[PDB]
Amino acid sequence: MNLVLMGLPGAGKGTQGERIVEDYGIPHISTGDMFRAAMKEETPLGLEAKSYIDKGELVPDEVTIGIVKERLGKDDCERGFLLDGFPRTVAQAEALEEILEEYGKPIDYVINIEVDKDVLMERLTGRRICSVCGTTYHLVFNPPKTPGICDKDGGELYQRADDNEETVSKRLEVNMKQIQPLLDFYSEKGYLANVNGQRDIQDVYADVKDLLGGL
Ligand SMILES: Nc1ncnc2c1ncn2[C@@H]1O[C@H](COP(=O)(O)OP(=O)(O)OP(=O)(O)OP(=O)(O)OP(=O)(O)OC[C@H]2O[C@@H](n3cnc4c(N)ncnc43)[C@H](O)[C@@H]2O)[C@@H](O)[C@H]1O
Ligand SMILES: [Mg+2]
Ligand SMILES: [Zn+2]
Numbered sequence: 300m301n302l303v304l305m306g307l308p309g310a311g312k313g314t315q316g317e318r319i320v321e322d323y324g325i326p327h328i329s330t331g332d333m334f335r336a337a338m339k340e341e342t343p344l345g346l347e348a349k350s351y352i353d354k355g356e357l358v359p360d361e362v363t364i365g366i367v368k369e370r371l372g373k374d375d376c377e378r379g380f381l382l383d384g385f386p387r388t389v390a391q392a393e394a395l396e397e398i399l400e401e402y403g404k405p406i407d408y409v410i411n412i413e414v415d416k417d418v419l420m421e422r423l424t425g426r427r428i429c430s431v432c433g434t435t436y437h438l439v440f441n442p443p444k445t446p447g448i449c450d451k452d453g454g455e456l457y458q459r460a461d462d463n464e465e466t467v468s469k470r471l472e473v474n475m476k477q478i479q480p481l482l483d484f485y486s487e488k489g490y491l492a493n494v495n496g497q498r499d500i501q502d503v504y505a506d507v508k509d510l511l512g513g514l
Contacts, residue, residue, distance in 0.1 A: 300379035300514040306412035308470040309422035329383035355469030364394045409485040412496035423467045427456040
């Protein structure tokens with residue numbers, strides 16, 4: 300089960316991905332998460348990516364493709380994987396084609412979680428994340444049982460640094476320019492699947508899960 304999740308900032312990649320990996324046990328690979336992990340560990344990669352991430356800009360293709368190529372070669376991707384937020388540019392998509400062709404693991408489905416851009420600002424500014432496990436909540440749409448703490452581990456919740464009005468707007472602008480070219484690319488490949496992500500989380504997942512049977 301080789302999957303790719305794409306969508307505009309805040310569309311629900313992390314939320315849907317969490318559910319996919321629990322049911323199928325494939326590794327959840329988020330380039331966003333990888334960059335932030337690096338930023339925390341303060342590796343040279345982390346510091347370099349930080350400049351772009353903080354501004355809402357895309358981290359350059361070369362270094363991004365590099366960390367994904369290495370990640371996909373790990374033993375835990377033997378039975379499949381869930382790419383989240385990558386590819387994000389046609390260039391990345393073409394590179395991934397070569398990478399998976401070398402690894403012998405072609406993509407089964409590219410799932411595009413479609414959400415109207417006009418509601419994404421609310422989704423991100425209201426997002427709260429667990430500092431311990433990374434699962435996300437929303438002040439209005441999916442609030443924690445107790446304000447400021449994770450239902451699972453009791454860890455303190457926080458607001459991602461780039462989830463502010465200015466940066467969110469920038470992220471939306473930047474990623475808007477990549478959507479259509481990416482959709483056309485995979486639609487041409489023959490395995491693009493569009494899912495209406497503007498419904499309750501479990502309703503969205505039902506459609507996502509419908510695509511995974513037999514993989
Ligand atoms: N390939 C690449 N190339 C170059 N640069 C790269 C790169 N990949 C990453 N980067 C860099 O890294 C940065 C960060 O990347 P990344 O972390 O991947 O940013 P993103 O694409 O903007 O996605 P988000 O994490 O913000 O949102 P999501 O879709 O997972 O949503 P979630 O499930 O949390 O949901 C959001 C909120 O909505 C709520 N929610 C979820 N579903 C619903 C629903 N159905 N109804 C109502 N609310 C919902 C949630 O509770 C939550 O509060 C980029 O800006 C870029 O700089
Ligand atoms: Mg995410
Ligand atoms: Zn947690």
